[PDB]
């Protein structure tokens, strides 16, 4: 109290489209609503103060709307760089409160990932542990499947994954997966492979290496 509520938690749009982001103030706050843009690993950036008032330096395509309770953030013609999370804020009554955020995704033509596999360093092997890393580079959409196989044995539960934020220029994603094994386990097998499934690939792609080759 007061509660700001923005409601699509996530939104996927095409560049050039018009985007409307809603914010429901659960109490009449007149034109005392504020909009912020926060991009990955960044502090918030004020887009619109007071419901619909301009902010210097902010691109003209951004605009605000609404009064009392229901509010709207609008992007005229959306650009790839508008990717990120959008917060609204109570600017009328303390305690100051923020909406939960709407994350904006930018659509693009389907792009298949570039796949690269990396063997463990001898430097790590000495420490008794072996990490094998599979890189999926610049793909769209985000949905991708990474499968680790060791001597055609499917691996499960011994790998961790991590996707990047959507690129601000080409709207692609990149993924990194690490298969971790003990030194003993690693040297008792030969063929290490990561299998990648993606909408941009007509058939699954496999990159591999034979240990010690």
């Amino acid at each position: 109290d007061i509660v700001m509520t923005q409601s699509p938690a996530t939104l996927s749009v095409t560049p050039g489209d018009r985007v409307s982001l809603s914010c429901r103030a659960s109490q009449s706050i007149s034109d005392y609503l504020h909009w912020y843009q926060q991009k990955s690993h960044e502090s918030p950036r004020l887009l619109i103060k007071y419901a619909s008032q301009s902010i210097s330096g902010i691109p003209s395509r951004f605009s605000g709307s609404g009064s009392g309770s229901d509010f709207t953030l609008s992007i005229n013609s959306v650009e790839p760089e508008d990717v990120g999370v959008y917060y609204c804020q109570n600017g009328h009554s303390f305690p100051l409160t923020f909406g939960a955020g709407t994350k904006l995704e930018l659509k693009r033509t389907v792009a298949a990932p570039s796949v690269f596999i990396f063997p463990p360093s001898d430097e790590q092997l000495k420490s008794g542990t072996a990490s094998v890393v599979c890189l999926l580079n610049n793909f769209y959409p985000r949905e991708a499947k990474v499968q680790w196989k060791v001597d055609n044995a499917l691996q499960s539960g011994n790998s961790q994954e991590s996707v990047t934020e959507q690129d601000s220029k080409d709207s692609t994603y990149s993924l990194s997966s690490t298969l971790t094994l003990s030194k003993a386990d690693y040297e008792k097998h030969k063929v290490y492979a990561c299998e990648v499934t993606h909408q941009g690939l007509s058939s699954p792609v496999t990159k591999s290496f034979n240990r010690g080759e």
Binding site: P44, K49, G99, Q160, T164
Partner: protein, 213 residues
């Protein structure tokens, strides 16, 4: 030149206290308020309170009262926020922000990461990933706590770079990947060095990445 520079990342034992700092510049520190905002991991913004450095008058959000404490230091142009009897739930990024006139904030600090854990700090290990286009990178493994900064060639190489978000291992340590795509013919000409900095353990490491054999 309005600049807000916040203190580095923190690791805090539960129940203990930490005093975060916000230094102001580019304006006359005396004149405008300074607010503090918390963002818990993968979540939204929650307001904490404000303080007028002109005299020292403060009002807080009051679920953060038996928790937060705000002070200023005009002689050094700096605001502080002491966090008391910390819980693992208090783990978050803490932003400071300068009002100009009302409840909206056009100026933010970069944020300060605070990790609440009984665990000790451990520096990472940096392992080479090593490969028309080639991919190479660094595996920054087994460190605590977040964050780690990673750059390539002292910042001179930014194109094609992807630094992935760290993953939390079963061991209780973080592991991070940072890669860059380069032409394979440059692997003989150009040197490639990932610059890894983990300030919670004061660890700076420069790792040159090479093909083997």
């Amino acid at each position: 030149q309005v600049q807000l520079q916040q203190s580095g990342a923190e690791l805090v034992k539960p129940g203990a206290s930490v005093k975060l700092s916000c230094k102001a510049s580019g304006y006359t520190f005396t004149n405008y308020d300074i607010n503090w905002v918390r963002q818990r991991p993968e979540q939204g913004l929650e307001w904490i309170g404000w303080i007028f450095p002109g005299d020292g008058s403060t009002q807080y959000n009051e679920k953060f009262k038996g928790k937060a404490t705000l002070t200023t230091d005009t002689s050094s142009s700096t605001a502080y926020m002491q966090l008391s009897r910390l819980t693992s739930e208090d783990s978050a990024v803490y932003f400071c922000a300068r009002q100009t006139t009302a409840t909206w904030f056009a100026y933010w600090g970069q944020g300060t990461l605070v990790t609440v854990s009984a665990a000790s700090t451990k520096g990472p290990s940096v392992f080479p990933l090593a490969p028309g286009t080639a991919a190479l990178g660094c595996l920054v493994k087994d460190y605590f706590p977040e964050p780690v900064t990673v750059s390539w060639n002292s910042g001179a190489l930014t194109s094609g770079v992807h630094t992935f978000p760290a993953v939390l291992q079963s061991s209780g340590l973080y592991s991070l990947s940072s890669v860059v795509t380069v032409p394979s013919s440059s692997l003989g000409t150009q040197t490639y060095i990932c610059n890894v900095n983990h300030k919670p353990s004061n660890t700076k490491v420069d790792k040159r990445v090479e093909p083997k054999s």
